[PDB]
Amino acid sequence: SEPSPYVEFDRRQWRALRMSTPLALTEEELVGLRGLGEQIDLLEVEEVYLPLARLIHLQVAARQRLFAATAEFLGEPQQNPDRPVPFIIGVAGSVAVGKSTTARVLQALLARWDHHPRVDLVTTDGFLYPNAELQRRNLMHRKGFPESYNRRALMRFVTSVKSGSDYACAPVYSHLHYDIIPGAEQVVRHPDILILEGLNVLQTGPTLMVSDLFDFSLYVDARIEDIEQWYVSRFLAMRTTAFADPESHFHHYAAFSDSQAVVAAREIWRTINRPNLVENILPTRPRATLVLRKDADHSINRLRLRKL
Amino acid sequence: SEPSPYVEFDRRQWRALRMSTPLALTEEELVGLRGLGEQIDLLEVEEVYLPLARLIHLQVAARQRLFAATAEFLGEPQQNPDRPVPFIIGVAGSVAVGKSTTARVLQALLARWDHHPRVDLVTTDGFLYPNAELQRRNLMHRKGFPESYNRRALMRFVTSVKSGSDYACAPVYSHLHYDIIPGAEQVVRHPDILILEGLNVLQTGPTLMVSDLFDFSLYVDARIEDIEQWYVSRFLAMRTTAFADPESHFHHYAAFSDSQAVVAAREIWRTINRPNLVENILPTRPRATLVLRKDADHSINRLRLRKL
Ligand SMILES: CC(C)(COP(=O)(O)OP(=O)(O)OC[C@H]1O[C@@H](n2cnc3c(N)ncnc32)[C@H](O)[C@@H]1OP(=O)(O)O)[C@@H](O)C(=O)NCCC(=O)NCCSSCCO
Ligand SMILES: CC(C)(COP(=O)(O)OP(=O)(O)OC[C@H]1O[C@@H](n2cnc3c(N)ncnc32)[C@H](O)[C@@H]1OP(=O)(O)O)[C@@H](O)C(=O)NCCC(=O)NCCSSCCO
């Protein structure tokens, strides 16, 4: 007898909402989107992602009719090929939670629909300030925090795209170089669906922000303590991986021993990622349209949907 | 070349968006909804309100199709007479801004449509805690502030109605008695549109709140300084009005002289209403779907719409 804005699901029940939804993705292509540590198999794609894709594609149609209503109020025509208001999806979660993978997968699944939609993916890491300006603000120790990103630029970019611009541009970020790529840019030209993935993308504030432009939002959740381990394991793993390359802004880590590294990583987590996570990311979870709850083994076996 | 989520209007331009919208309200009925101080004439109803009503009725249809999409995802039928998800409208603004009037008018205009919708109006003042419990919380001096209302109850009520409940109930408040009416209740039975009007109705928080359930939101704005005068004038005016009645929890004011009162009122404003206004209400203005900007003469001659 107690109504709720949320609907809780166990994967076993959620998996049934897939219905006819075809699986237009392969085992190959899947590993080509898989992220370091993420153990996502086709089964999870069919049981978790496909239902989500169906939910989203049902929403896109209706949400665009809603904007069209306002356009009709403004005496504004739907000139040219009815260029519907792009549908914006936000994907957030902690560092090392798996959100990068989630978004790449969602883009693929969402893209492979019979009416062939234009689906773009944009990570907000490209809106982080170059390291230079990052120190001119004494924020190199807070990289990842809301402040470390150019929120006005990010808001403009998304506002321009949802506004109907023929095109808009974003910077590009280099994870190896740990910094923005000079002159490098990412162009987005009037997509049917735009997905924005990043740490604080769901953050709120005194002024309208990108979170206020999302038509749907995804939050990748995990036991805080479980993510710490994922982060470390990935740290160590990366020693013999990305770091190795001398061009790694962190090559000085490759030489670390299991112990040393784990010690270094754990500290970084305690001083930067955990705080940002707790102070800025978690707080947004309640308003996310859909929460993907992962177990210590990376498997998403539980979800929380906002039906209201 | 700079896109915006907002569209600014002068009444002179906004008034044209009325189109064919019939004026189903009379000069009589209008004063029967007018509030103490509010100088709203039929002309403003036709130039300001009617366009708003048209905007809202265009939105209702589409917004309900959007929820129906989710319902379809959940394998949930639209059984019985497709009882569409009620459309919730929030109306906020400072004390003495005119929001009470605005909402009564909107209800009337919105109700008089050819398809005859069920439009309910609920002031959140009925969710204020009885004065008793108000002191058990040391909050009689903060009456009006978020804390003074039972936000869990309010959230339940609205969540129940938008949930599709055959009916839900709210307490009733007595402005003369300055307190909740014992055993008194207000029943709402599955409306097509529910309007919630009050001070902090747009407030946000760590948890989902009623603001998160609004399908549209109205903010009644005025120069902070201008509202102070409206408040006082209404104070003095009320001396020879509501107060007069000895049952007035404030009869002790009727005997005040122009000076005295103005002095009393101004202080109350400075210690209670202005702070709440500045600390809790104003902050919500940026996210309101539509802002009604009033001049010192109560005339709404400017507006800001959120098209995004
Ligand atoms: C920029 C930030 C916040 C990462 O932000 P994101 O939104 O990209 O989140 P996240 O780090 O989880 O995702 C990064 C993606 O890009 C990869 N990546 C992350 N950091 C690095 C890196 N340093 N070098 C190469 N690749 C990296 C990572 O593997 C992810 O790709 P996959 O989806 O294929 O697995 C993080 O790299 C950072 O610098 N944080 C400051 C605190 C901190 O963690 N300092 C230690 C830096 S060395 S440990 C590298 C892994 O965290
Ligand atoms: C409860 C609260 C916050 C009012 O909340 P609301 O959401 O109703 O806003 P607001 O006061 O603007 O609207 C009240 C409506 O109800 C009427 N009203 C307000 N206060 C009283 C009253 N005390 N006695 C009789 N009627 C009243 C007022 O005329 C409005 O009706 P109209 O639309 O027909 O004009 C206010 O009455 C209060 O007690 N505030 C605490 C600080 C304060 O103002 N203290 C002085 C109280 S005596 S001055 C009465 C006018 O403010």
A234 CA: distance to closest CA in chain B (Å) = 31
Reduced to 3 states (helix: H, G, I; strand: E, B; else coil), residue B183 is strand
**Other Cβ atoms closer than 10 A to A205:** 12
Closest partner CB to B58 (pick from A73, A286, A307): A73
Q: Report the relative pairing of strands A290-294 and A179-188 from DSSP bridges.
A: unpaired
Looking up tokens 């902050």, which residue turns up? B283
- Second CATH level (architecture) for the domain A1-308: 3-Layer(aba) Sandwich (3.40)
B93 CB less than 6 Å from ligand 2?
no
State whether residue B66 sits within 8 Å of chain A by CB.
yes
Tally Cβ neighbours within 10 Å of residue A50: 22
CB atoms within 10 A of CB B156: 18
Report the alpha-carbon distance of residue B300 to residue B47 in Å, rounded. 10
Quick check: CB of B125 below 6 Å from ligand 2?
A: yes
Which candidate from A55, A65, A163 shows the least CB-CB separation from B62?
A: A65
* Alpha carbon separation from B58 to A57, A68, A74, A256, B154 (Å, rounded): 23, 9, 11, 63, 27
- Ligand 1 atom closest to Cα of residue A199: 7
CA B156 to chain A, closest CA, distance in angstroms equals 7
CA distance B122 to B117: 16
- Burial code (b: 16+ CB inside 10 Å, e: under 16) for B97-111 equals bbbbbbbbbbbbbbb
Lookup result for tokens 């589409």: B62
State this model's resolution in angstroms.
2.3
Distance, CA of B33 to CA of A46 (rounded, Å): 56
Q: Phi first, then psi: give them for residue A206, nearest 5 degrees.
A: -60, -35
Q: How far is B71 from chain A (nearest CA, A)?
A: 8
Q: Is the CB of B143 under 6 A from ligand 2?
A: yes
CA B235 / ligand 2 centre spacing (Å):
9
**Residue B68 corresponds to which tokens in the numbers above?**
């129906």
A282 part of contact set with chain B, CB < 8 Å: no
Q: What angle do CA A171, A176, A182 make, to 5 degrees?
A: 30
Subunit contact A287:B65, Cβ cutoff 8 A: no
The separation between CA A12 and the C-alpha centre of its own chain, rounded to angstroms, equals 24
The residue of chain A nearest to residue B162, with distances taken between CA atoms, is A308
Rg of chain B (C-alpha set): 20
Report the candidate in B229, B217, B296, B302 with the shortest Cα–Cα distance to residue B262. B229
Helix (H/G/I), strand (E/B), else coil: B38: coil
Q: In B, which residues are within 8 Å of A159 by CB distance?
A: 3-5, 308
Q: Helices A224-238 and A258-268 meet at what angle, rounded to 10?
A: 130
* Residues in chain B that come right before a backbone break, where C and next N are over 2.5 Å apart: none
Q: What is the rounded distance in angstroms from the CA atom of residue B177 to the CA atom of residue B250?
A: 8
Q: Is any ligand 1 atom within 6 A of the Cβ of residue A35?
A: yes
Approach to solving: X-ray
Instruction: Give the residue, by CA position, lying nearest to ligand 2 atom 15.
Output: B100
- Chain A residues touching B152 at Cβ < 8 A: none
What does the alpha-carbon distance between residue A122 and residue A158 come to, in Å, rounded to a whole number?
Answer: 10
Mutate to test the interface with A, among B2, B152, B217, B307 (most CBs of A within 10 A): B307
DSSP state string for A228-256: HHHHHHHHHHHIIIIITTTTSTTGGGTT-
Round to whole Å and give the CA distance between A282 and A278. 6
DSSP per-residue letters across chain A: ----SEEEEEHHHHGGGGTT------HHHHHTT--TT----HHHIIIIIHHHHHHHHHHHHHHHHHHHHHHHHTT----TTT-PPPEEEEEEE-TTSSHHHHHHHHHHHHH-STT---EEEEEGGGGBPPHHHHHTTT-GGGBTBGGGB-HHHHHHHHHHHHHT-S-EEEEEEETTTTEEEEEEEEEE-S-SEEEEE-SSTT---SS--GGGG-SEEEEEE--HHHHHHHHHHHHHHHIIIIITTTTSTTGGGTT--HHHHHHHHHHHIIIIIHHHIIIIIGGGGGG-SEEEEE-TTS-EEEEEEE--
Under DSSP, the state recorded for B120 is E
Cα A274 to ligand 1 centre (Å): 14
**Dist CA A295 CA B44 (whole Å):** 58
A274 vs A199, A226, A227, A228, B86, CA distance in Å?
12, 12, 9, 8, 41
Question: Which residue's alpha carbon is at the smallest distance from atom 48 of ligand 2?
Answer: B250
Kindly give the pairing relationship between strand B179-188 and strand B193-197: unpaired
Q: Can you list the pairs that A244-253 forms with residues at least 24 positions away whose Cβ atoms lie under 8 Å?
A: A245/A176, A247/A176, A247/A177, A248/A176, A249/A176, A249/A177, A249/A178, A249/A179, A250/A178
| Nearest alpha carbon to residue B156 among A3, A58, A59, A292 | A3
Count CB-CB contacts under 10 A for residue B31. 11
Ligand 2 pocket residue status of B101, Cβ below 6 Å: yes
In whole angstroms, how far apart are CA A4 and each of A11, A16, A308, B122?
20, 22, 8, 20
**Spans of all domains in chain A:** 1-308
Beta strands in chain B (DSSP E): 6-10, 87-93, 119-123, 168-174, 179-188, 193-197, 216-221, 290-294, 300-306
Tell the residue nearest (CA) to atom 23 of ligand 1. A175
For the sheet with B87-93, list strands across it: B6-10, B300-306, B290-294, B216-221, B87-93, B193-197, B119-123
Beta pairing, strands B300-306 & B290-294: antiparallel
Q: CB under 8 Å to B71, separation ≥6 — which residues?
A: B78
Separation of CA B11 and ligand 2 centre (Å): 28
At B50, list the tokens: 């009617």
The number of CA neighbours under 13 Å toward the Cβ of A231 is: 24
Is B98 annotated as belonging to a binding site? yes
* B97 labelled ligand-binding: yes
Amino acid making up residue A113: W
Which amino acid, B196? Answer: L
Nearest residue of B to residue A86 by CA position? B308
Query: Gaps (C–N > 2.5 Å) in chain A: which residues precede them?
Result: none
Rounded Cα distance between A288 and A93, Å, is 11
What distance in Å separates residue A287's CA from the closest CA in chain B?
A: 7
Put simply, whether A283 touches B (Cβ < 8 Å) is yes
Measured CA to CA, the distance from residue A63 to residue B110 in angstroms comes to: 23
Question: Would you say B119 and B192 are in contact if contact means Cβ atoms under 8 Å apart?
Answer: yes
B107: which DSSP letter? H
Contact between residue A38 and residue A48 where contact means Cβ atoms under 8 Å apart: no
Query: Could you tell me whether strands A119-123 and A290-294 are parallel, antiparallel, or unpaired per DSSP bridges?
Result: unpaired
Residue linked to tokens 């201008």: B226
Distance CA A194, CA A215 (A): 10
CA gap B260, B252 in Å, rounded: 12
Is the minimum CB–CB distance between B169 and chain A shorter than 8 Å? no
- Tell me how far apart the terminal alpha carbons of chain B are, to the nearest angstrom: 17
| Probe residue for ligand 2, chosen from B30, B134, B175 as the CB with the greatest number of ligand atoms within 8 Å | B175
Closest CA to B218 of B268, B279, B285: B285
Return d(Cα B121, Cα B136) in angstroms, integer.
Answer: 30
Is B99 labelled as part of a ligand binding site? yes
The neighbouring-strand residues paired with A169 are A187
